[PDB]
Design a protein around this nucleic acid. Structure first.
Length: 546
RNA sequence: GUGCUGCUGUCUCCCAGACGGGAGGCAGAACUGCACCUUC
DNA sequence: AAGCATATCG
DNA sequence: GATATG
């Protein structure tokens, strides 16, 4: 029902108290994850930082449960599982024992807890006020039965206040529920957990106003946020570095436990935005502390047909007669695009010439099709001089890969200079060179992957991950800018309805491009639906017939 | 603030095997442009 | 899988 | 304000 947007703000001088709170929250969250997994008393698998998976048997979980304060698990097993499935939301939603998973911590950890006795929020009590013995869910009944057995108030490894425990339990339950859904999807084929860590896999340490986590206050001074976190040990004050997503912020404490923030998103438009902040998430990434600010926001005949081409970024028609037509995102630099295509082809053919060379080295020519495929296309596409011997051929391939790498670096630098060569004005918002670079890097990653595995016969996870990062980031940026261009063209033309259908399918699944454009068009207030310039005209006409 | 996103100098690890490739850490110069919902 | 609300007694 | 449960 609600709508969210998000951004991170970096904080530099984090006091020791906040770092200790962060680390303790991560440790207790890992403890809760392991405890909930142990309560199911079923064998599972966990993957560590090295990437290999270990399988934990039932005996280790039994030992952990006995360490956590339950001296006789096998005699109370049916209760524990009955509790755990309630926490992970594996019961009927109508009779949910814990609507939010944090609610169990009072039963889990508190000594003098009175949970499970109060009934003021029961609808029957409300109706009697206006004028439970069987109503109790199995999840709460099992928890009470465990508590009265002297078993359930487990020993938390590190002492924390109730609110921080609730936040840690919330994060742990979220991760475990996601893993459990994945495990169900895997078992239904006819699945490994990942314990949270302070640096290798952080959880969002949450601060909230209603009671989940410690309370927080945020204000704005000039162009930066000032955040005060109300830890039990004091009140830590922080100042975030200015962010161009929140360039000129100004906040107001609302009367409904929320902070209204008004900011300016630095773009060409510099449009003002308003949002509501209610929870804040501290996270550590490579030694730097970022607060995830997730803010709610309020979303806002002329029709268009949109065609998502590859050589043009898109073609639009507006309108019966189409008095407005055009293309957006054409080729900007002819020679750059041509060189990009040539290098992509070179890498594509080299990836196969490597395998053919290995086969020749270890077995010799096998059949006519291998030799002909090498001679007609692999030799000139990877243009290179053939060598009969093994090591000389390997050295020639090495020289060819060096040349390819140098050309790739030059092409990347030229593409980067599109925003800094005093010709920024000529540069368009979107162009086909983005997709061409994506294809080029996808082919080049494969080429280097084949090259690195030359030594072994035909027969670490850090390999080439910089290229993976670049590919993913460039693809995300391309999608963002394409969506921006589409919505900008829609809004400038005053359209109210949009109709829309080595290719796009190889870069994205059929869904997320359409879903992203649909969501962004709806957010601005423009409706859209699924059914060159002629294709866009045809799409618009097809929508018009309906 | 995350990216688009690079260049130069320098340093440390890994795969080879004297042809090359891979992952990062610092120090500079240049430009200050274009978009941004994120975690699992 | 998520990025809160509301009641009650003190 | 501190629990507690929608």
């Amino acid at each position: 029902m609600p709508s969210y947007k998000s951004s991170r703000v970096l904080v530099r001088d984090v006091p020791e108290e906040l770092v200790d709170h962060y680390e303790r929250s991560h440790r207790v969250a890992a403890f809760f994850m392991r405890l909930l997994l142990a309560m199911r008393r079923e064998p599972y698998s966990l993957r560590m930082r090295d990437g290999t998976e270990r399988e934990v048997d039932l005996d280790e979980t039994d030992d952990f449960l006995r360490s956590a304060g339950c001296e006789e698990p096998d005699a109370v097993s049916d209760d524990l599982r009955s509790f755990a499935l309630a926490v992970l939301h594996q019961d009927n939603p109508k009779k949910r024992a814990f609507l939010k998973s944090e609610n169990c911590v009072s039963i889990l950890c508190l000594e003098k807890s009175a949970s499970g006795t109060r009934y003021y929020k029961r609808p029957g009590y409300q109706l009697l006020k206006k004028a439970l013995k069987t109503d109790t869910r199995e999840g709460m009944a099992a928890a009470l039965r465990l508590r009265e057995r002297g078993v359930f108030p487990v020993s938390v490894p590190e002492h924390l206040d109730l609110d921080s425990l609730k936040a840690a339990m919330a994060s742990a339950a979220e991760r475990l529920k996601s893993w459990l859904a994945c495990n169900q999807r895997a078992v239904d084929e006819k699945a490994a957990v990942t314990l949270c860590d302070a640096d290798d896999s952080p959880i969002k340490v949450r601060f909230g106003l209603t009671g989940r986590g410690r309370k927080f206050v945020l204000s704005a001074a000039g162009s930066r946020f000032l955040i005060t976190v109300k830890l039990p040990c004091g009140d830590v004050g922080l100042t975030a570095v200015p962010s161009r997503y929140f360039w000129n912020p100004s906040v107001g404490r609302t009367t409904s436990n929320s902070f209204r923030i008004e900011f300016t998103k630095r773009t060409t438009e510099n449009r003002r935005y308003v949002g509501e902040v209610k929870e804040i998430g501290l996270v550590r990434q490579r030694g730097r502390y970022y607060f995830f600010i997730d803010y709610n926001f309020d979303p806002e005949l002329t029709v268009m047909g949109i065609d998502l081409g590859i050589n043009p970024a898109f073609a639009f028609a507006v309108c019966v007669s189409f008095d407005s037509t055009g293309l957006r995102g054409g080729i900007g630099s002819q020679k750059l695009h041509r060189e990009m295509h040539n290098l992509s082809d070179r890498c594509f053919y080299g990836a196969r010439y490597i395998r053919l060379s290995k086969k020749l080295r270890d077995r010799g020519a096998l059949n006519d099709i291998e030799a002909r495929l090498l001679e007609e296309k692999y030799i000139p596409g990877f243009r290179i001089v053939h060598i009969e011997d093994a090591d000389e051929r390997r050295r020639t391939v090495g020289r060819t890969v060096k040349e390819i790498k140098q050309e790739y670096k030059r092409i990347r630098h030229q593409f980067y200079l599109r925003y800094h060569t005093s010709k920024r004005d000529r540069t368009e918002l979107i162009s086909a060179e983005y997709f061409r670079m994506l294809f080029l890097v996808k082919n080049l990653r494969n080429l280097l992957k084949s090259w690195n595995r030359y030594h072994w016969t035909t027969g670490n996870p850090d390999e080439l991950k910089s290229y993976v990062r670049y590919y993913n980031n460039l693809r995300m940026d391309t999608l963002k800018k394409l969506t921006c261009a589409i919505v900008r063209t829609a809004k400038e033309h005053g359209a109210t309805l949009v109709a829309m259908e080595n290719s796009l399918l190889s870069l994205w699944a059929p869904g997320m491009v359409l879903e992203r454009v649909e969501q962004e068009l709806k957010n601005e207030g423009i409706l859209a639906w699924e059914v060159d310039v002629n294709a866009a005209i045809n799409i618009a006409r097809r929508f018009l017939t309906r």
